């Protein structure tokens, strides 16, 4: 009997998870160039099918989290980093389900607008991905994607408030508001989450500085 | 001077949260049934009832994981159990409570179908809390209410779409509209919560596989 | 080469983190009081600020647990006091957001009380912080806090159920009833979350017990 030593590739897996979240999220720009019902349904079950590996990818992580005692860095930040990328693909799903059960007007610029922002932060995240075995030797370009993820969720919060702000002067049909509120929501939260994957990345820094 | 063993006994706490689970679904079902205020109330009042309870054995097992070196299986998932149980038990709550406030039109089929289908998950989540014992020497029937909890929630899932989207299609008064829609949110939410118990169940069986 | 002590300062952090969370509810209660919009994006972005600053004493909170191996009482705890301090102070926050975007019709009484019971909540939470040094020896002050705001909460919730069932069964104009449901439910989130405070503080004292 001999030692065989356990391969947790910590950092593969996130990676892994970080591309299926891109990839999730270039599906949601092109799905909101599409205005029917047929189109979307293709979508967000393309999207759904992200979200299923999503979450195994991420069950995966904490399962190899919870039998390896050796982790390259504190294993709450790496619990967190897989929960937070998880829940922003679960946004961008939850967002191509409720474009296709309310069944809206051609979404407007905005909302395409949000779309391009979370493909935006998921292409930070991805990056920031690439930094997690050298920014204990050099944080300055991992410090750089978590200041750009700030200042996306900034610009996607302006674009929402000021959506919504104009929705309730502007919208007379309740039914209509109703539903592109909801879609909005669901956008703006994604765009939150994916700040949140920034945010633990930064503290990582502080931790190991 | 003598050594006194600490009896917590964190499967009959697990399984004492689900018996409160399954009782709480078996009222929301039988709730639908009225639709009158008064009889709302008195099944909302019962709910909470519940609720209270099952926050209580939900804080008594942190608790005890807090103050004991030794568990059956990872503290985590005992912890995560049990928060995601009762989190079960809340949206159960939040669903009857929604019903009163907002007091809509009897109830439909399908609210009624998601009632069944959260006391279907309850009966599910309580055949596996008999598992947590034997898992370990053969996991396939917990793997197997594993299993139906995922189909659960796919039916669950696809009643509140259809539902929602033709609602949309159909319901002309708006404020008729808020009020079911808020009511059906609260219930797919959580037949949602349900199977992420099933989901913790899974990944122990994977963690000590 | 000598040893240098670290000098976390758990309570002092947590005290600060509090009397962020106090100057914001002071806010929010003020807040209210006016009905223009300019005086509305005022305040929201006075409520911001100290939201930034809330953010900010958490992570700190968060970063120098991650690093210190010795703490007064059990991490968990001291995590998750500054996690929930941070929800009240990001409710509110959403809650002065809320009356921005959606630009509603002077709140009403019962807006204006959930505002002073989140006050009312948030002056209770800096008493119990106030007693984490000394709940060891004398629980029963803190205690008698935790008490208050279960209680604070039970009231807070019945404004909310209340105004809602009458905004039910009155207002007409789905679109003013939509903005005004929005923001009460952002309050009775808020005042939810800091009972939830008041819980882990129950429970701090049980396992100490």
New interface residues.
Partial sequence: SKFTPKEPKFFPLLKQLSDVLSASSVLLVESMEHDLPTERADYYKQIKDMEREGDRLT?LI??EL??TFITPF?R??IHDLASCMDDVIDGINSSA?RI????PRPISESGKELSRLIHEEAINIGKAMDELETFRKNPKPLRDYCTQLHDIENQADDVY?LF??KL??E??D??E???I?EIMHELEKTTDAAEHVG?ILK?LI??YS
């Avoid at 296709?100 to 069944?103: E, T």
């Fill in positions: 069950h904490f399962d919870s039998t504190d709450e930040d389900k296709v059960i309310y069944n408030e919504i702000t309730f002067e919208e007379k309740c039914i508001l109703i539903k509120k945010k503290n502080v931790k």
